[PDB]
Amino acid sequence: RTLWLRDRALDLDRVRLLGVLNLTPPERALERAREMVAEGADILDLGAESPVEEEKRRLLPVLEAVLSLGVPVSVDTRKPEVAEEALKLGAHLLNDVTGLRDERMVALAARHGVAAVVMHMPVPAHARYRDVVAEVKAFLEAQARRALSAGVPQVVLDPGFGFGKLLEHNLALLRRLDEIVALGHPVLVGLSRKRTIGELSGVEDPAQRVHGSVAAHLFAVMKGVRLLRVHDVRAHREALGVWEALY
């Protein structure tokens, strides 16, 4: 399988990394991108919303600069206004947190010939499900179908670990992640420094959760995932160097 990135195709024959760059409370962020690129990041994932709509000042300035590195860039935004601007600047992947529930986001991606990420999260986010795996699978597939039939070239599915989900829900989704991978679409996961990792590894500080995050991600890779959103790029590249040679 391959991942379409607006004007290039990335093969998923090996695990690919999306290096996270959080622009939430500059030129001191461009070197961090060049830093992750040097560490092995395949895609740079920029997000500015944890805010008002003029979050364009938090993103666009950095986005344009980062785009000059020649590396694919994913933009995390809910607002179609922000996305459209990011796309006409060169964005390669549209990461919709609200699971593309916004028809404007769908239309945008289809119009720019860019793939979109469909992440799961409660309609609103209450962590209450009759069957979390069955429900998330259904939502992801249904949203993907809507996007594809609307013109979006490709859809990436993200279970949305941590979003409206308690430990039991995140565990269930991870254990049956192969079933989400079996829907055919490329699957993306991001458990870096998340509460789930803290809960299972006993690490109080989110900033010190690299080992549990790597462990969770290797498990996801074993389940068939080939796209990971991570904070510690180098740690994952080193771990994958070993893992991919053994599995």
Place this chain on the structure above:
Amino acid sequence: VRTLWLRDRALDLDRVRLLGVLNLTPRALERAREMVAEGADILDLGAEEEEKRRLLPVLEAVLSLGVPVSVDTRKPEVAEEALKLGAHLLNDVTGLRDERMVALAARHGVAAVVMHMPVPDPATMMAHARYRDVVAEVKAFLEAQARRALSAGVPQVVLDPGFGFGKLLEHNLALLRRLDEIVALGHPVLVGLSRKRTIGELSGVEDPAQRVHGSVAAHLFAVMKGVRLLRVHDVRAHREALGVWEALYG
């Protein structure tokens, strides 16, 4: 349930157990305290004579913590003094080829580790990494030494494929990929890839002290293959990784 005999108690292998490395070669109670706090189930002490003055004094102090202690040594003289002091596990560095070590383990009622290496001499073993079938040959050596040790009175034997001992990357890779076949021999399996060349090669990390992420990855793979005993330098990192891994894969 599967367990590991440790001189005067049994350790359940219902979950992965860690042997924290404490190398005393060119306080120790403190670091030992730290490793125990970090999650080490067994403390591995090795000073690889003068080997006695360096190990014994420390071994006695560390033993007072009440945590099982594994001792690594090639000299029976040191092993006997360590066992007489109370060490709980006899780790080998020659493949348990010395009958004297076998006798000590059985006499003191302690389990012994049988680690594979083509030849005991560390300076010549890389000249003996020419296996026709490394997995088959390592399995044969381990099972043979296991039978010999058990028949001589040793209560239990722990098998270690000896990663990085007289083995090319191709050999270490083959052994890791088919580690389940060694686990299938029925004895508890111990692996130690911490900071090893294999990790440096596959992860692209030249500094041995900076190989924790590749080591954790290799060890999680070993755990997936069935291994429940890991010899590690970074105890906390492994406890954190296992907290996640064991909750998921189980």
